[PDB]
Amino acid sequence: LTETMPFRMTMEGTVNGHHFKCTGKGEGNPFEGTQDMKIEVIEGGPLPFAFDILSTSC
Amino acid sequence: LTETMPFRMTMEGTVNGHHFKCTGKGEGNPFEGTQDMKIEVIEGGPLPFAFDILSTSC
Amino acid sequence: LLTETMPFRMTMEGTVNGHHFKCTGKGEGNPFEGTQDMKIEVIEGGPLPFAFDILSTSC
Amino acid sequence: LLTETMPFRMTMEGTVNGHHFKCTGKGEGNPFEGTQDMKIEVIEGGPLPFAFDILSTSC
Amino acid sequence: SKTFIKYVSGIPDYFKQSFPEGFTWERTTTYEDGGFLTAHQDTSLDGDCLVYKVKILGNNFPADGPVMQNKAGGWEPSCEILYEVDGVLCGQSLMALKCPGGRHLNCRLHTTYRSKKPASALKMPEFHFEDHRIEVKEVQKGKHYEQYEAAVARYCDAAPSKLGHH
Amino acid sequence: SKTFIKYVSGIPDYFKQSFPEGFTWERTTTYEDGGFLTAHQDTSLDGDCLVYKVKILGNNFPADGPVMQNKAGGWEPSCEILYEVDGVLCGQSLMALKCPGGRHLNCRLHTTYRSKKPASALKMPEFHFEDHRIEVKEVQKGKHYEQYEAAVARYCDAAPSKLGHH
Amino acid sequence: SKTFIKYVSGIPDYFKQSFPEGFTWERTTTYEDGGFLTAHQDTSLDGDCLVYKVKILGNNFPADGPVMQNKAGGWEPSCEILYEVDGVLCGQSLMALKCPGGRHLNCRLHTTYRSKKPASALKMPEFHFEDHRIEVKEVQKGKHYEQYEAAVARYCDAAPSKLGHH
Amino acid sequence: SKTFIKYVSGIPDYFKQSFPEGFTWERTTTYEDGGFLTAHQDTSLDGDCLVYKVKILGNNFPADGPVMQNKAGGWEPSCEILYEVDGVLCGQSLMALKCPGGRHLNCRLHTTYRSKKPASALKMPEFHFEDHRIEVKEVQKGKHYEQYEAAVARYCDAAPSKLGHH
């Protein structure tokens, strides 16, 4: 890869009966192991649960 | 409801990286607690895992 | 080997959440109809600082 | 209250899958450098009919 | 397919009460050999037809296990406990999958059933049991299946209370 | 106290078969709020008397939970599944502790039952169910208790098979 | 986002090796208060862009818990163990969610990582650790979030072997 | 043997603070193949000597598993998370037992550490990690063993924060 790779994300889900969709966009340093991203809830917002449960999926 | 009720089903999933889709058609006696259905694997067949894990979802 | 009315006795020793206790038990029941009654006494570590219910399945 | 080299003494009793056993242990370490060594002897129920590894975190 | 349950002893029927709006359920089944099977289901009534929409995510099934090796022999009958939690109905059950050699592989079902009706319109059942039997026929290898179920919701009448409780 | 079970439908009695040698059992009960209750029990027959010796280790019960706060209301009736594993008898059950405000706290029992007879001298039961009801009376606060149980071992007669399974 | 890991000590990089074909991962996270969060993720390389596709099913979260009440304070840093199972890479980790009053809610992550490359083209890593830090900012309530992560894959150098292990 | 830990970054030492009174710990370790190992430990200081008293109950280990077959190869190094709950110190860790053929069997440790000092007399540590390495030599088959451990308590300095937390 190169030392600053961009990425894009789509997410669909249901948590406790609540349907939602998210998009994400970011970049990071693949070999240095650092990254940043922005996530937007595009359906089912405002999220009716802690976003923290979605963190490891992003 | 009525002593005989029909039902339809659509199912889509991923198990151990295997994507699949199923459809279902059946009928039962709602008040007597009995039912029968037929399930067809329409995508990702022949199923690469035991169908049994899908039974409680059907 | 077993009678229609069968007695039993129990001794129990344990630690739950740092609390030591000992119990003794006496009872009887019908082995073939599957019923039984017993009395349990906390002989050490009483009064029990936890719900006795967690010991029921052990009695 | 603790010294650079600190000795310890251990007694262990238990049951695993119906097998009763007793162990004793002796060791020493550096409480502040976080290192230690010990010897464990199975004094009852030996030789152990299970992997000693399951007892390691208890020693 | 929780609309098909025989209720006895005057236990209110959470699922049938939910119509016309219907209900959903959500479940994670945890297998003793490390597999997980998670599902969300939507149940609706459309004319004189019940309509089920299911989403499945299964993972961590051992490659050498009966599931991935496709060597399972169906489920034993099972017993579910159901009771009110957070104004909805929770379900818990242990199931046992038949394996080669007369062996079994057990799992635990963690379920929440959610009416689409408001609480004001519903009679919530007391703690009770549901007996289930699921039988499957593989008609065409990995393609066509037939499934039968019988379900009964009841209290514990087999082991009676001495104090008149359920 | 597994000697006191009513066995129906000709199901072999693993426990009564074990006498005069007797049996043991071992169990870990895992509570949904993080508690664990582990026990080993030895059952012997001393002439006309059954003798039980129990050792208990319980841990990780939440300080604010119904167990440590001593605010539990007893057990709901329960259903255990039993079947042969490794030439001995395994038992699995979910139980539900009654809590203040019509709430329940659930747990899972993982049991192995071990006869002191060799497996070659026993007729092993097929997969079956045991219905349990345990009722407890607190006679003196934290000191004296009375316990009643009824137990029945059975197949699934409530939801019968279409094929001929027990 | 497993492509962004700093590997040390000559540990092979299962994820970067997987390109151009990419990889998938699957996970069930079990929460100590009864919640489950299951996910499947597909990772692909499309030109100069990494493309993530995620499916999520979460269930059984207590209505009164910090998740559904939306009162979580982010994750503590975490340690994942990784090792080969069934010719793929398995990951196991405990995480701790910060709660109001300096409390934590723990959970366990059960992961399988699956290269889309054949095994013949891959160097599988030995047992190793991955240190993770995830930090989140809520930019707009329930709508816009920023997430930062740092990850390092390593052996245990902090507590060394007197026997020459990793 | 929790007295032997190297604490860095000024993390308060729950165990050394507990003397002369000492402390206890309690733990259930759950194995992925169904085994449970439960222990209670008492730690006292007697003059120049630390005294440990341990009680163990283990159950449900598979007859054909590496534990009962005595075919285990020792533990991988491990990471424990520790934090305050209910005014005492809780510990949680995943461990991995080496099996023949480069395989591992994982387990989870659920620990509560209890000082014999009241909480008012202790400085409680914040959330932190303990790195552990345990190495065992079998001197005499099932009779004599030697065990070495190194332990270090630390914050996550490997994957550092942006927001200024430990």
Task: Give the DSSP H/E element, type plus range, for residue G14.
Answer: helix G14-17
A19 touches chain G (CB under 8 A): no
Distance CA G56, CA A9 (A): 13
Tell me the three state secondary structure of residue F131. strand
Chain E residues with at least one Cβ partner in F under 8 Å: 76-79, 81, 83-85, 92-94, 96, 102-104, 106, 108, 127, 129, 131-133, 135, 148, 150-152, 154-156, 158-163, 165-166
The Cα of H50 is separated from the nearest Cα of chain D by a number of Å equal to 4
Distance CA G23, CA G51 (A): 11
Cβ–Cβ under 8 Å, residues E15 and B1 = no
Model resolution, angstroms:
1.8
**Residues paired with residue C16 on neighbouring β-strands, in sequence order:** C19, F58
Task: Give the DSSP H/E element, type plus range, for residue G17.
Answer: helix G14-17
Structural tokens at position H7: 């604490």
G110 touches chain B (CB under 8 A): no
Sign of the dihedral through C-alpha A17, A18, A19, A24: negative
Number of domains within chain D? 1
The Cα of E159 is separated from the nearest Cα of chain F by a number of Å equal to 5
Structural tokens at position F4: 């006191």
H112 touches chain C (CB under 8 A): yes
Choose among D6, B26, F81, G70: nearest CA to E52: B26
Radius of gyration of chain C (CA): 13
Distance CA B6, CA E135 (A): 19
Choose among G37, H107, F92: nearest CA to E59: G37
**E108 contacts in chain G (CB < 8 Å):** none
Sign of the dihedral through C-alpha G78, G81, G86, G89: positive
Parse chain E into domains and list their residue ranges.
1-166
Architecture of domain G1-166: Beta Barrel (2.40)
Distance CA G27, CA G37 (A): 8
Structural tokens at position G34: 């009864």
The Cα of C5 is separated from the nearest Cα of chain F by a number of Å equal to 10
Distance CA G85, CA G92 (A): 12
Burial of B42 (0-12, 13-18, 19+ CB in 10 A): middle
Residue C43 Cα distances to C3, C47, E87, F136, H150, angstroms: 29, 9, 42, 18, 42
| Nearest-Cα residue of chain F relative to residue D13 | F55
The Cα of E106 is separated from the nearest Cα of chain B by a number of Å equal to 12
**C14·F4 Cβ contact <8 A:** no
Residue H143 Cα distances to D24, E154, F101, angstroms: 11, 54, 54
Residue with tokens 């003196």: F140
Helices and strands, counts by H and E, chain D: 0, 3
First to last CA, chain D: 22
Residue C7 Cα distances to C38, D51, E28, E120, angstroms: 9, 39, 44, 52
The Cα of B38 is separated from the nearest Cα of chain G by a number of Å equal to 26
Cβ–Cβ under 8 Å, residues H14 and H115 = yes
**G51·A7 Cβ contact <8 A:** yes
Choose among F68, F78, G125: nearest CA to H114: F68
- Nearest by CB to G133, which of H104, H127, H161? H161
Distance CA G89, CA G77 (A): 22
- Chains A, E in contact: 3+ Cβ pairs under 8 A? yes
Q: Chain A: list its partners (3+ Cβ pairs within 8 Å).
A: E, G
**H92·G94 Cβ contact <8 A:** yes
Distance CA F165, CA H52 (A): 54
Distance CA H33, CA E33 (A): 6
**A49 contacts in chain G (CB < 8 Å):** 58, 61, 67-68, 70
Structural tokens at position B52: 């049994």
Distance CA G89, CA G87 (A): 7
**H81 contacts in chain G (CB < 8 Å):** 76, 78-79, 94, 96, 106
One-letter amino acid identity for H36? F
Q: Where are the beta strands (DSSP E) in chain F?
A: 6-7, 23-31, 36-46, 49-59, 78-85, 88-99, 103-115, 128-140, 144-154
**Residues paired with residue E157 on neighbouring β-strands, in sequence order:** none
Tell me the three state secondary structure of residue F119. helix
Q: In the Cβ-directed half-sphere of F10, how many Cα atoms lie within 13 Å?
A: 1
Sign of the dihedral through C-alpha H154, H157, H161, H164: positive
Residue F72 Cα distances to F97, F98, F99, angstroms: 7, 6, 5
CA angle, residues B38, B41, B47, in degrees to nearest 5 = 120
First to last CA, chain F: 26
Helices and strands, counts by H and E, chain H: 0, 9
- Nearest by CB to A40, which of G61, G68, G143? G143
Residues 6 or more apart whose CB falls under 8 angstroms from that of F82 comprise F89, F90, F91, F92, F113, F125, F127, F128, F129, F130, F153
Q: Chain H: list its partners (3+ Cβ pairs within 8 Å).
A: C, D, E, F, G
Residue E51's Cα: distance from chain center in Å?
17
Residue C55's Cα: distance from chain center in Å?
8
**C15·H114 Cβ contact <8 A:** no
Residues 6 or more apart whose CB falls under 8 angstroms from that of G6 comprise A31, A32, A33, G151, G152, G153
Residues 6 or more apart whose CB falls under 8 angstroms from that of E21 comprise E115, E116, E117
Residue G32 Cα distances to C11, C43, F35, G66, angstroms: 34, 35, 11, 12
Structural tokens at position D15: 């049951």
Burial of G33 (0-12, 13-18, 19+ CB in 10 A): middle
b vs e for C12-42, b when ≥16 Cβ sit within 10 Å of the residue's Cβ? bbbbbbbeebebebebbbbbbebbbebbbeb
Sign of the dihedral through C-alpha G10, G14, G16, G18: positive
F29 touches chain C (CB under 8 A): yes
Residue H49 Cα distances to A37, B25, D36, F133, G84, angstroms: 54, 73, 14, 50, 43
Distance CA H71, CA G76 (A): 36
Q: H75: which DSSP letter? A: B
One-letter amino acid identity for E10? G
F4 touches chain C (CB under 8 A): yes
One-letter amino acid identity for E123? K
Cβ–Cβ under 8 Å, residues H154 and H80 = no
**E59·G86 Cβ contact <8 A:** no
DSSP chain E: -TT--EE-TT---HHHHTTTT-EEEEEEEEETTS-EEEEEEEEEEETTEEEEEEEEEEE---TTSTTTTT----BPPEEEEEEEETTEEEEEEEEEEEETTTEEEEEEEEEEEEESS-GGG--PPPSEEEEEEEEEEEEETTTEEEEEEEEEEE---SS--SSS--
G8 touches chain A (CB under 8 A): no
- Cis peptide upstream of residue D47 (ω within 30 degrees of 0): yes
Structural tokens at position E157: 């009448």
Residue with tokens 């065992």: H136
Residue to substitute from C3, C21, C55, C58, interface F, most F β-carbons within 10 A: C58
Cβ–Cβ under 8 Å, residues C17 and F61 = yes
Choose among A15, A6, A2: nearest CA to A45: A15
Residue C1 Cα distances to A45, F22, H3, angstroms: 69, 11, 54
Q: Where are the beta strands (DSSP E) in C1-59?
A: 6-16, 19-30, 35-44
Cβ–Cβ under 8 Å, residues G10 and G157 = no
**E127·F96 Cβ contact <8 A:** yes
Q: G15: which DSSP letter? A: H
**D10·H45 Cβ contact <8 A:** no
Task: Characterize the bridge pairing of strands G78-85 and H36-46.
Answer: unpaired
CATH of the domain at B51: 3.30.1300.40
CA angle, residues F118, F83, F114, in degrees to nearest 5 = 35
Owning domain of residue D14: 1-59
Task: Characterize the bridge pairing of strands A5-15 and A18-29.
Answer: antiparallel
Tell me how long chain F is.
166
- Chains A, B in contact: 3+ Cβ pairs under 8 A? no
Distance CA H112, CA H91 (A): 6
Distance CA H42, CA H24 (A): 4
Distance CA B50, CA E67 (A): 5
Residue E50 Cα distances to B41, B54, F138, angstroms: 20, 19, 50
DSSP F18-37: GTTT-EEEEEEEEETTS-EE
**A17·E26 Cβ contact <8 A:** yes
User: SS3 sequence, G30-64?
Assistant: EECCCCEEEEEEEEEEECCEEEEEEEEEEECCCCC
Residue with tokens 């449900």: H60
**F70·C59 Cβ contact <8 A:** no
A56 touches chain E (CB under 8 A): no
**B14·G112 Cβ contact <8 A:** no
Number of other CB atoms surrounding residue G152 within 10 Å: 20
**H32 contacts in chain E (CB < 8 Å):** 34
Structural tokens at position F24: 């043991």
**D25 contacts in chain H (CB < 8 Å):** 52
CA angle, residues E142, E146, E149, in degrees to nearest 5 = 130
Distance CA C57, CA F92 (A): 13
Residue to substitute from G8, G30, G76, interface H, most H β-carbons within 10 A: G76
**G58·A7 Cβ contact <8 A:** no
